[PDB]
Amino acid sequence: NVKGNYVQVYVMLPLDAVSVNNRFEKGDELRAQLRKLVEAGVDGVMVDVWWGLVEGKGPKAYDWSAYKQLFELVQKAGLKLQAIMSFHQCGGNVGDAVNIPIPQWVRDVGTRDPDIFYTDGHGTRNIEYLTLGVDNQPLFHGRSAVQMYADYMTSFRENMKEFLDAGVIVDIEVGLGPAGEMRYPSYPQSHGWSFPGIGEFICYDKYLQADFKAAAAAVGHPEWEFPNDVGQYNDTPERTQFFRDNGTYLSEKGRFFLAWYSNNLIKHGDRILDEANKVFLGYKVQLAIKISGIHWWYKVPSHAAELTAGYYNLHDRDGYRTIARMLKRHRASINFTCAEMRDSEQSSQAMSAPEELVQQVLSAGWREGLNVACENALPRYDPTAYNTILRNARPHGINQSGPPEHKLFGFTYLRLSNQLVEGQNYANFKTFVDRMHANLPRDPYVDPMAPLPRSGPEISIEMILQAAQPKLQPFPFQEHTDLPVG
Ligand SMILES: OC[C@H]1O[C@@H]2O[C@H]3[C@H](O)[C@@H](O)[C@@H](O[C@H]4[C@H](O)[C@@H](O)[C@@H](O[C@H]5[C@H](O)[C@@H](O)[C@@H](O[C@H]6[C@H](O)[C@@H](O)[C@@H](O[C@H]7[C@H](O)[C@@H](O)[C@@H](O[C@H]1[C@H](O)[C@H]2O)O[C@@H]7CO)O[C@@H]6CO)O[C@@H]5CO)O[C@@H]4CO)O[C@@H]3CO
Numbered sequence: 001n002v003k004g005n006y007v008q009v010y011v012m013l014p015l016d017a018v019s020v021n022n023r024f025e026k027g028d029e030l031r032a033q034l035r036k037l038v039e040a041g042v043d044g045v046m047v048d049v050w051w052g053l054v055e056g057k058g059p060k061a062y063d064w065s066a067y068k069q070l071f072e073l074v075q076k077a078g079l080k081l082q083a084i085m086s087f088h089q090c091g092g093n094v095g096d097a098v099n100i101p102i103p104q105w106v107r108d109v110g111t112r113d114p115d116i117f118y119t120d121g122h123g124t125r126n127i128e129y130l131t132l133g134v135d136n137q138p139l140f141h142g143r144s145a146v147q148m149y150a151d152y153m154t155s156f157r158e159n160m161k162e163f164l165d166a167g168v169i170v171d172i173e174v175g176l177g178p179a180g181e182m183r184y185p186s187y188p189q190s191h192g193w194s195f196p197g198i199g200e201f202i203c204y205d206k207y208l209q210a211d212f213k214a215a216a217a218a219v220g221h222p223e224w225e226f227p228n229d230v231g232q233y234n235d236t237p238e239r240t241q242f243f244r245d246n247g248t249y250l251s252e253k254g255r256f257f258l259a260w261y262s263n264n265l266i267k268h269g270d271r272i273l274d275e276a277n278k279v280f281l282g283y284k285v286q287l288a289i290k291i292s293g294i295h296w297w298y299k300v301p302s303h304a305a306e307l308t309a310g311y312y313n314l315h316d317r318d319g320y321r322t323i324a325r326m327l328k329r330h331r332a333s334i335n336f337t338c339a340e341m342r343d344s345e346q347s348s349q350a351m352s353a354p355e356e357l358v359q360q361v362l363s364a365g366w367r368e369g370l371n372v373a374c375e376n377a378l379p380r381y382d383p384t385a386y387n388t389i390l391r392n393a394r395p396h397g398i399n400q401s402g403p404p405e406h407k408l409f410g411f412t413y414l415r416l417s418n419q420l421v422e423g424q425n426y427a428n429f430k431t432f433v434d435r436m437h438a439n440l441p442r443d444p445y446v447d448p449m450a451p452l453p454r455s456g457p458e459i460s461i462e463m464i465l466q467a468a469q470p471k472l473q474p475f476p477f478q479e480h481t482d483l484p485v486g
Contacts, residue, residue, distance in 0.1 A: 133207025
């Protein structure tokens, strides 16, 4: 009996599932594409629920019309639905077809208060997301950012209650930064970063500067400032005194700054997840966050790109198990990425280790008792990619008589297009789904969810950080799947 091996497969809908005008205008095309997903046995779909579309008119002027039409179509296709609370800009980089900023009335606050945006050491403002520094600042016609997020989720729950009750909506992913990821905008691809630069620390907004000053004063070092020996976006670690091997990242001051920077992300996630848990209390849904996959520089001592993204991960410090520990009280899950990548596929100069990073994050989630799901980082249509995903989905292979010791709770494929569902691409994709399902038919009843309980007691940052050390080896992963596409 191999049923416990089944891993659900979701497919991300196009970024334009709802138009930039907040109208649902590609229903017939989508219905035809969803037929192909149903033919393939897919468990459900995933979609961005864009803040800039829904609350674009003004405060609390939510327009759910288009999303309700979309969700009805998905329900009528017999598919489940994962909804992202997308509190960030869609697109805005060079060549992006779909461009949806956060609400204009929110950005208008930035004219008199530009420090509502994450800001770099140059003073450049990133307009894709509101700094965590304004989470509890009542700057937005009397509301704080967290209040806006909570109110949006409340309105979503009220409007989408029938889809929740019917078992259509099964997961809520809470966007926590740029691209919906719990990170800083440290790698701004259209404004001065190119892969594989180290990135930069994006903590110069006046709110975060004041918070650092207070933190530094509480430990008797009022004079401390952010590190200045950090180079710039497109540097490599040895270009800098901070990130080089044996560099200043190791110093007392460096450790304090890195802990402060990464802790703020953890605290941001904790406070917003608490609000999300209160909103969805009693509904049969999983809450999730999305951790960015920063695989470049993983092989060097400083892990520089992870550090600037906000993940304080080193050889001897588990910067993902701390995040996982924070999620535990909420019974929140991790949605990770890079599930399709092999190390051999990456350029040498990027010092990139996606396989090891995936193993680290999955192992950290499992050690904290969490569900862990994953996505592919880049578009792939080939058997090798599918077989890499399969390995990561069941690291120990198939258990012949029960559940395996570890497995992904789900996989979400990025992303649906016409190209996916024709030709050889489609044949490869359908076989993948079969393999993820352990060669069983689709099970509409799989992975039932209990009504969501209230978050457990708030734990301090010090309690969360007990998870950082000692750093443990990952659980063993097979080199290759035992159930390949063929
Ligand atoms: O809309 C842009 C992009 O958004 C999303 O991508 C994320 C991605 O999930 C993150 O992992 C990160 O990407 C990193 C990579 O992880 C990192 O390896 C590196 O990427 C390099 C690739 O490794 C290398 O193959 C090559 O990429 C090619 C690739 O062969 C092509 O597929 C093509 O990419 C286009 C995609 O087809 C298209 O979907 C879209 O990309 C989305 C992506 O789907 C989504 O998941 O547009 C791109 C065109 O840029 O061409 C590229 C050549 O550029 O080279 C890159 C080196 O740049 O670095 C990236 C970050 O640059 O971040 C992205 C962005 O949020």
